[PDB]
Design a protein around this ligand. Structure first.
Ligand SMILES: [Ca+2]
Lengths: 57, 216
């Protein structure tokens, strides 16, 4: 699967509290984390469906 | 955590919570119909909640109002966060009282060393948090964030870390001597040494704010 799917979730420098989904390689499933609101990385999805399609493998 | 203390109930009447299903950013009431917040807090649909203390319980003093217009600074940069300021016009005027009040815009830019009050639910946010911190000299801000600080930003906090605003506080107020001098924007981590919080310098946008409110 894509390499960005194996990188840990990135909150970013902004201080908002936005719930996003990221692929947890170690768990083989998408979970939620707190996104700060800016400079998102690729392992950041607005829904579990998009997260699994892209990183499900 | 944050390193702050729970604010006294309704002691920060100009503080608001931006909600789109859950609390995601803060803001400040500048007049009975307008709220100022951070541009990175933009969402097409936003409900503003005033008179809050514990955002997870219906206390009876709150006012819930939807945003009618959301206006970001035309020069906001999503990458550098320069000009990270946004205005929100409420669908209808709110009722001002002891728990819901406005905060004054700056008369001028507060000098470094000025003690201020930072508030937000940034902590599972629950009770409104408060923090007393001073505006730091621009040189120290620049030294902490090499080549990342513009003249529209100011650092507030401590170079040793320990106390700082964090996720959930964005858009919130930094008030010094009764005037809104800053808006919670960004920082590398929270409360880390040599990395104090960076805030939007409101005194550089007073005319833009006043002109925008007048034309809308
Ligand atoms: Ca409440």
């Amino acid at each position: 699967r894509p390499d960005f799917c194996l990188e840990p979730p990135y909150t970013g420098p902004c201080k908002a509290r936005i719930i996003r989904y990221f692929y947890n390689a170690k768990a083989g499933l998408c979970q939620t984390f707190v996104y700060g609101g800016c400079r998102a990385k690729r392992n950041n999805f607005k829904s579990a469906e998009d997260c699994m399609r892209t990183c499900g493998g | 955590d944050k390193g702050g203390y729970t604010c006294q109930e309704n002691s920060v009447p100009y503080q608001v919570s931006l909600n789109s299903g859950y609390h995601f950013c803060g803001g400040s009431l500048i007049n009975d119909q307008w709220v100022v917040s951070a541009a990175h807090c933009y969402k097409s649909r936003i409900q503003v909640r005033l008179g809050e203390h514990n955002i997870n319980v219906l206390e009876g003093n709150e006012q819930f109002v939807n945003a009618a217009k959301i206006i970001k600074h035309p020069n906001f940069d999503r990458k550098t966060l320069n000009n990270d300021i946004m205005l929100i016009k409420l669908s209808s005027p709110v009722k001002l009282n002891a728990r819901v009040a406005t905060v004054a815009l700056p008369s001028s830019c507060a000098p470094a060393g000025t003690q201020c009050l930072i508030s937000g639910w940034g902590n599972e946010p629950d009770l409104l948090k408060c923090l007393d911190a001073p505006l730091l000299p621009q040189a120290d801000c620049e030294a902490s964030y090499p080549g990342k600080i513009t003249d529209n930003m100011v650092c507030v906090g401590f170079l040793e870390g320990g106390k700082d605003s964090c996720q959930g506080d964005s858009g919130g107020p930094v008030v010094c001597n009764g005037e809104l001098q800053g808006i919670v924007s960004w920082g590398y981590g929270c409360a880390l040494p040599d990395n104090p919080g960076v805030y939007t310098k409101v005194c550089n946008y007073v005319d833009w704010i006043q002109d925008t409110i007048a034309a809308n």
